Write a protein that binds this ligand. Structure first.
Ligand SMILES: *[C@@H]1O[C@H](CO)[C@@H](O[C@@H]2O[C@H](CO)[C@@H](O)[C@H](O)[C@H]2NC(C)=O)[C@H](O)[C@H]1NC(C)=O
Lengths: 50, 973, 106
C-alpha cells in the first residue's frame, strides 16, 4: 500500500481460511501502531567543559 | 433611430436629474412637485414605449452606472473587484437580479410619496472590577472559515463576555443548554439572561471600570445595555456579524427550536425583552430611583440595528475615550522619562489599533456605499471630535518616520478626483481643495491652545510648512501656457487657504471642521474678525505668499527649470469669493476637458466606443453640477453679507447671470496673475453644452445604447464566498495533514490500469481524516474544513509546475483535480476503498443522513451547493504566488459542463501532456523515438472503453479539446 | 545570516553561530550557536560492520568535531565490508553495499 495510506492508520486484516482451523478461519490485524517502541529512554547530558 | 436619439438623451438626463433631486429632497409645494414628476414620468414612459434596452433594464443599468461612476472611480466596469457586502447595497438600491427598473422607480416614488441567579459572573471584558487589575479582553479581529467566511467586523470585548446565562454552560468545553427547550422556556431563559446582563453591566459601569465609563446612570451604561440588547437580538436572529464560540451553537439551536420564521418571533417578543432591561433598571433602585426609561422606552433600532455598525460605533467610542486618556497622560507627564514612556505607550496603542480600524472601515464603507466611517464616529459620539482617524491611521510608510507617535507627536516635544459636494446648496468642492493639505497643521493645532503668542508663532510656522508642501506638490502635479494654468492653480490654493484661516471655508470636512473649531477658541462674529486681523497685520499675507513662492522655487529647482513670471510677482489681487473662485476653477476644468474630449471625438470617430463612453461619462455629471452652480449663483447674484443666506459677502460679482459672469472672466487667455479660466466657447452656450442636445449633431448615443448590454454582465452570484478578493479565506484554512509533495512524478508514463487512471491517485492530496477509517464528526465543521484542508491541492505551481510548464497549464491541472474532487464525492471510477467503493463517499452520506436527510450528497453539497470552496486558488497562490487571470478563475470554480464522468476527461488530460510532450520530443536515437509507440497499443483498449454522441475518441480530441489537435492522431510507428 | 561552523557527517552536527539582531535597537544583539544533531537511533556500533552492537550511547564532544567513532553514513562516502558467499560449496569474497542508494558507479 502507499505510504500515505499506511500512515493514515488503516487496519489490514489477514484472513486465512484453512481446513484444520478450529473455526476454519483466522484473522490477524496489522496497524500503523502494531509495532511501536513502548519505552523511549533518552538521557541528555549537557556539560560545559571536556 | 430618427428623432428618438434626442429623446433618449433627454430621457437619460431627465432620469438622472429627478433621481438626484429626489435623493436630495429625501410641504404644500412638495405635493405639487411630486405630482409634476409623476405626470412627467408617465409621459416619458409613453415615449419610451414608442422607442421600444427595455425601460426596466435601463433604470437598473443607470443605477449601476452611477454607482460605478461616482463611488467607484474611473467608471471602469470591473465588477470583479466589488465584494459581497456592496452587492447587497447595490441590489437593494438598483434592484434584485435585473429588469426590475420599473419597480425600483415605482417603489422609490412611493417612498417619496410617504416621506435571578443564572451563573453569569461580573463583567471583566474591559478589565476586572476593582480590586481586580488585569483581564482585559482584546478585540477579536478574526473571521471563521466555516461560519461567515470573510467578515471584517471585529467582535467587541463586551460581546465576547455577553451573559449567555442559562442558554450556554462552559462545563468541559461548550455545550448548548437548550438542546430540547420549549419556545416559552427559551423566551424565559433569554429574558433572564438579558436581565442579568443589564444588572452586571450596571454594576460594571457604576464602579467605573468599563473604558467607556471611566441622567444619573453611569456614563455610557445606557450605550452598553442597548448594545448588549442588539447583540442578543442578532444572536436569536442568527445574523451575527462574526460568530464567537458561544454564538454559533446558540444561533443554530435557537433556529432549530423556533422552526419546529425566527425573525417574526423576535419581532413579536422584542417589546418583552426590552421590558426586561427596563425592569432591571427599575430594580437597580434597590441600591439607592430610576424610572427605567433612561435607556429608551423603545428597543434600539434603525441604522444602529445593523450589528456591524453597532460594533464599529462601540469601537469608535472606546478608542476615542482611550485616545483622550492618553492625551491627558501625555500632557500631564510632558507638561524625557515619563513623558517619553507615555508617548511610546500611545504609539503602541495606535499600532495595535491600526489593523482593527482598517478592517472595520473597510467593512463599513463597502457595506454602506458613500457614508464614511469617521463621519459616523464623530457625529454619534462627541468625544471623537478631537480625532482625525485618517491622519492617525495613515498607511504611508514615510508617515511613521515623520510622526512616530501620531497626532500627539507635537505634544511629544491625484487627478481623477471627481468634483464632489460631500462635506459641504448645490455647490461642489474642487479636486484641488480636497487635495489642499492640512496634514502638518493638525499636530500643532492639537498641541497649541489657550496661549495667544505661542499659538500665533507655531501656527504661522506650520502654516508656512504646509504652504511650501502644497506649492511643491501641486507644481509637480500640474507641470510635467501650461505654467500659466498652474500659476492660478497655485494662486487658487493659497486663495482657498485664506478662508480656512478666516473661517469662511465652505467645505466642512473633518480637517477644516476641526481647524475652524479650534481657531474659534484660539483667536477668540468678532472671533472671525480676530482671525482676519492676524491676516491683515503682522504682512502675514505677504509672508505666507513668500512661503508659497519659496515652495515653487524649491520645486522648480528640483526640476531644474527657470523661475516663472507669475510667482515673481509679489503683490497679488484681492481675494474673490470662494464660490466664485471655485466656479472659475470648474469652468476652466470644463474648458480643458471639453476641448480635449471633443478633439478626441473629431480624431477617433477601433476604440471609438471607449471614447464615446468616456466623453458621455465625463459630461453627464457636469450638467448636474452646472445646474447646482447656476442655482447658487441665482441665489447670491446680488447679495451682501447680511442678505446672503451664509455669513459671507458676495457684493463684488456684479453680473446679471452666471453665464454672463462666465463672460468677461474667460473671454481672453490665461494670464495667471488675474486670469485663470479660458474656454473656446465664450458665448452663452454653456447651458446648452451641458445638456446633450446641441453638440455638432454627431450621434454617439448609439454607443451608449451599445453600452447597455453590459447589464447582462451585471450578474449576481448570490453566494457568500467570493473567488475574487484581491485571499481572505486563504489564511484561515491550513495545510492538509499527511499528504506529501504531490505531483512528484506525473505525466511521465506512470499511468496504469486498476480505463487508464492518470496520476489522480497521488495528485489528490486529501487530508488524513477523510481518507482514513475515522468518520467525521460534523459536516459543517470537519468535512467543511477538511475538503478546504486540501489547500495542499496547490502544489502544482507550488512545487512541480512552478517552472516545468507554462503558467496556464498548472492551473489547467487544477481544473482536472476539481472535477476529479467532484466525482469522488459522487461516483468516480477509481475502485479503491479510499476513493471509490470507499467510505469517504459514505462519510458524506452518513453525516447528511444524520441531519434528518436534509440533502443528498448528490442532491446538494455535490460540489454544486458549495462548489466554490477556495477553488484551490489559495494553494495556487500560497506557494506559486501567481495572479490568476479573470478568465482563468472560472474553471477552478464551478462550471456547468461536468466533462462526462471522468471517462473522457482523464482521457482529455492524456494527450494534453502524456502524448504531446513525447510528440515534441520526437520532433526534437530513432529507436528511442520509435520507443514512443507503446502508447499506440494502449490507445486500443481505451478506444474499446470509449466505444461503450461522437463516433470515437479521435473526434473528441479534434473538436471538444483545444491543445489536442496539435497531437498526432495515431503514432503507428 | 547563518555561519555553518561545522557540518561533520559522522557525528551529525550543524553548529551555526548565526547572529540575531535584537529588536530594533542594536548593541544588545544576541549570538546563538544552534547545535543541530541527528542521532541515528538505529546505526550499529561499528557502523561499517553490521554485526556490531547497537549504539546505546552517543558522545558529542563538540571540541573534537570543531577541529573516528563514526555514527552516521555520509551521503557521498560508501561504507561497505566483505561478505562470505556460498553457491556450491565455494566461499567467495565480494564487496557489499550497506548504502546502495549513494553507491551507484559514478
Ligand atoms: C570496525 O571499525 C574499524 C575501525 O574502527 C574498521 O576496521 C577496518 O576498516 C577498514 C576500512 O576499509 C578495512 O579495510 C579493514 O579490513 C577493517 N579491519 C579489519 C580487521 O577487517 C571497520 O569499520 C570495522 N571492522 C570491520 C571488520 O568491519
Amino acid at each position: 500500500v502507499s505510504e500515505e495510506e499506511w500512515n493514515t492508520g488503516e487496519t489490514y486484516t489477514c484472513v486465512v481460511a484453512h481446513e484444520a482451523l478450529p473455526n476454519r478461519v483466522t484473522e490477524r490485524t496489522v496497524d500503523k501502531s502494531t509495532g511501536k517502541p513502548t519505552l523511549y529512554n533518552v538521557s541528555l547530558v549537557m556539560s560545559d567543559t571536556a | 433611430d430618427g428623432n428618438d436619439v434626442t429623446f433618449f438623451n433627454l430621457f437619460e438626463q431627465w432620469n438622472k436629474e429627478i433621481q438626484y433631486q429626489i435623493e436630495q429632497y429625501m410641504c404644500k409645494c412638495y405635493k405639487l412637485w411630486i405630482e409634476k414628476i409623476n405626470d412627467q414620468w408617465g409621459k416619458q414612459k409613453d415615449n419610451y414605449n414608442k422607442f421600444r434596452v427595455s425601460l426596466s433594464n435601463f433604470l437598473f443599468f443607470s443605477c449601476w452606472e452611477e454607482y460605478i461612476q461616482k463611488y467607484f472611480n474611473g467608471d471602469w466596469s470591473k465588477i470583479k473587484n466589488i465584494g459581497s457586502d456592496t452587492f447587497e447595497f447595490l441590489i437593494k438600491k438598483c434592484g434584485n437580479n435585473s429588469a426590475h427598473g420599473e419597480e425600483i422607480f415605482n417603489e422609490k416614488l412611493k417612498n417619496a410619496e410617504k416621506k435571578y441567579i443564572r451563573g453569569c459572573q461580573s463583567k471583566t471584558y474591559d478589565g476586572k472590577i476593582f480590586p481586580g487589575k488585569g483581564g482585559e479582553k482584546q478585540w477579536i479581529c478574526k473571521d471563521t472559515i466555516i461560519h461567515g467566511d470573510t467578515n471584517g467586523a471585529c467582535i467587541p470585548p463586551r460581546t465576547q463576555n455577553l451573559c449567555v446565562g442559562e442558554l450556554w454552560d462552559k462545563s468541559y468545553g461548550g455545550r448548548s443548554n437548550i438542546k430540547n427547550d420549549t419556545k416559552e422556556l427559551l423566551k424565559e431563559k433569554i429574558k433572564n439572561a438579558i436581565h442579568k446582563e443589564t444588572e452586571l453591566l450596571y454594576e460594571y459601569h457604576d464602579t467605573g471600570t468599563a473604558i467607556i465609563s471611566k441622567n444619573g446612570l453611569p456614563k455610557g451604561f445606557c450605550h452598553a445595555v442597548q448594545r448588549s440588547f442588539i447583540d442578543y437580538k442578532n444572536m436569536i436572529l442568527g445574523t451575527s456579524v462574526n460568530i464567537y464560540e458561544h454564538i454559533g451553537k446558540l444561533q443554530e439551536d435557537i433556529k432549530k427550536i423556533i422552526e419546529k420564521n425566527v425573525n417574526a418571533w423576535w419581532k413579536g417578543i422584542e417589546r418583552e425583552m426590552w421590558d426586561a432591561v427596563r425592569c432591571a433598571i427599575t430594580k437597580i433602585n434597590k441600591k439607592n430611583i430610576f424610572n427605567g426609561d433612561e435607556c429608551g422606552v423603545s428597543p434600539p433600532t434603525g441604522n444602529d440595528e445593523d450589528q456591524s455598525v453597532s460594533w464599529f460605533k462601540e469601537w469608535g467610542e472606546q478608542f476615542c475615550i482611550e485616545r483622550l486618556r492618553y492625551e491627558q497622560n501625555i500632557r500631564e507627564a510632558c507638561t524625557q522619562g515619563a513623558c517619553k514612556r507615555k508617548c511610546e505607550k500611545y504609539k503602541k496603542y495606535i499600532s495595535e489599533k491600526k489593523q482593527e480600524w482598517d478592517k472595520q472601515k473597510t467593512k463599513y464603507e463597502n457595506k454602506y456605499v458613500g457614508k464614511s466611517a469617521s463621519d459616523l464616529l464623530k457625529e454619534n459620539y462627541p468625544e471623537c471630535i478631537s480625532a482625525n482617524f485618517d491622519f492617525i491611521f495613515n498607511d504611508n510608510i514615510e508617515y511613521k518616520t515623520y510622526y512616530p507617535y501620531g497626532d500627539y507627536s507635537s505634544i511629544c516635544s491625484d487627478n481623477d478626483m471627481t468634483w464632489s459636494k460631500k462635506y459641504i446648496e448645490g455647490v461642489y468642492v474642487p479636486p484641488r481643495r480636497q487635495q489642499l493639505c492640512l496634514y502638518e497643521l493638525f499636530p500643532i493645532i492639537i498641541k497649541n491652545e489657550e496661549g495667544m503668542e505661542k499659538a500665533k508663532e507655531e501656527l504661522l510656522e506650520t502654516l508656512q510648512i504646509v504652504a511650501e508642501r502644497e506649492a511643491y506638490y501641486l507644481w509637480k502635479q500640474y507641470n510635467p501656457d501650461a505654467n500659466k494654468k498652474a500659476c492660478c492653480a497655485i494662486r487658487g490654493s493659497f486663495y482657498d487657504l485664506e478662508d480656512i484661516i478666516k473661517g469662511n471655508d465652505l467645505v466642512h470636512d473633518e480637517y477644516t471642521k476641526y481647524i475652524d473649531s479650534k481657531l474659534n477658541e484660539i483667536f477668540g462674529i468678532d472671533t472671525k474678525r480676530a482671525r482676519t486681523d492676524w491676516w491683515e497685520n503682522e504682512t502675514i499675507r505677504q509672508l505666507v505668499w513668500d512661503a508659497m513662492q519659496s515652495g515653487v522655487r524649491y520645486a522648480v529647482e528640483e526640476k531644474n527649470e527657470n523661475f516663472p513670471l507669475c510667482m515673481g510677482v509679489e503683490h497679488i489681487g484681492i481675494a474673490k469669493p470662494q464660490f466664485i473662485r471655485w466656479l472659475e476653477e470648474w469652468t476652466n476644468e470644463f474648458c480643458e476637458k471639453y476641448t480635449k474630449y471633443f478633439e478626441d471625438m473629431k480624431s477617433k470617430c477601433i476604440e471609438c466606443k471607449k471614447a464615446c463612453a468616456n466623453y458621455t461619462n465625463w459630461l453627464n455629471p457636469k450638467r448636474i453640477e452646472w445646474n447646482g452652480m447656476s442655482n447658487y449663483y441665482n441665489k447670491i447674484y446680488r447679495k451682501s453679507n447680511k442678505e446672503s443666506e451664509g455669513g459671507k459677502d458676495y457684493s463684488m460679482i456684479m453680473a446679471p447671470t452666471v453665464i454672463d459672469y462666465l463672460n468677461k472672466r474667460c473671454h481672453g487667455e490665461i494670464n495667471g496673475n488675474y486670469i485663470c479660466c479660458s474656454c473656446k466657447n465664450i458665448g452663452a452656450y454653456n447651458t446648452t453644452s451641458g445638456t446633450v442636445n446641441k453638440k455638432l449633431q454627431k450621434k454617439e448615443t448609439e454607443c451608449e445604447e451599445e453600452k447597455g448590454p453590459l447589464d447582462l454582465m451585471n450578474e449576481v452570484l448570490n453566494k457568500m464566498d467570493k473567488k475574487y478578493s484581491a485571499m481572505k479565506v486563504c489564511d484561515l484554512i491550513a495545510d492538509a495533514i499527511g499528504c506529501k509533495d504531490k505531483t512528484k512524478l506525473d505525466e511521465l508514463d506512470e499511468w496504469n490500469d486498476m480505463v487508464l487512471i492518470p496520476p489522480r491517485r497521488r495528485q489528490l492530496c486529501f487530508s488524513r481524516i477523510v481518507r482514513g477509517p475515522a468518520n467525521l464528526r460534523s459536516l459543517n465543521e470537519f468535512k467543511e474544513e477538511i475538503l478546504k484542508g486540501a489547500q495542499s491541492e496547490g502544489k502544482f505551481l507550488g512545487n512541480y509546475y512552478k517552472e516545468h510548464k507554462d503558467k496556464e497549464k498548472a492551473l489547467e491541472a487544477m481544473k482536472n483535480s476539481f472535477y476529479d474532487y467532484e466525482d469522488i464525492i459522487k461516483g468516480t471510477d477509481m475502485l479503491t476503498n479510499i476513493e471509490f467503493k470507499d467510505i469517504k463517499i459514505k462519510l458524506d452520506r452518513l453525516l447528511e443522513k444524520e441531519t434528518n436527510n436534509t440533502k443528498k450528497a448528490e442532491d446538494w453539497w455535490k460540489t454544486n451547493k458549495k462548489s466554490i470552496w477556495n477553488a484551490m486558488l489559495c494553494g495556487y497562490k500560497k506557494s506559486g504566488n501567481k495572479i490568476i487571470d479573470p478568465s482563468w478563475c472560472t474553471i477552478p470554480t464551478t462550471e456547468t459542463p461536468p466533462q462526462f464522468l471522468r471517462w473522457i476527461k482523464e482521457w482529455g488530460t492524456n494527450v494534453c501532456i502524456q502524448k504531446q510532450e513525447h510528440k515534441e520530443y520526437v520532433k526534437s536515437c530513432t529507436s528511442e523515438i520509435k520507443k514512443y509507440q507503446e502508447w499506440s497499443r494502449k490507445r486500443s483498449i481505451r478506444w474499446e472503453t470509449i466505444s461503450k454522441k461522437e463516433p470515437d475518441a479521435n473526434t473528441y480530441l479534434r473538436e471538444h479539446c483545444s491543445k489536442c489537435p496539435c497531437g498526432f492522431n495515431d503514432m503507428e510507428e | 545570516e547563518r555561519i555553518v561552523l561545522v557540518d561533520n557527517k559522522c557525528k551529525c552536527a550543524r553548529i551555526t553561530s548565526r547572529i540575531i539582531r535584537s529588536s530594533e535597537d542594536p548593541n544588545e544583539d544576541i549570538v546563538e550557536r544552534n547545535i543541530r544533531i541527528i542521532v541515528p537511533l538505529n546505526n550499529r556500533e561499528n557502523i561499517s560492520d553490521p554485526t556490531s552492537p547497537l549504539r546505546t550511547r552517543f558522545v558529542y564532544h563538540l571540541s573534537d568535531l570543531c577541529k573516528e567513532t563514526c555514527y552516521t553514513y555520509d551521503r557521498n562516502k560508501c561504507y561497505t565490508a566483505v561478505v562470505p558467499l556460498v553457491y556450491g560449496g565455494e566461499t567467495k569474497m565480494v564487496e557489499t553495499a550497506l548504502t546502495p542508494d549513494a553507491c551507484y558507479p559514478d
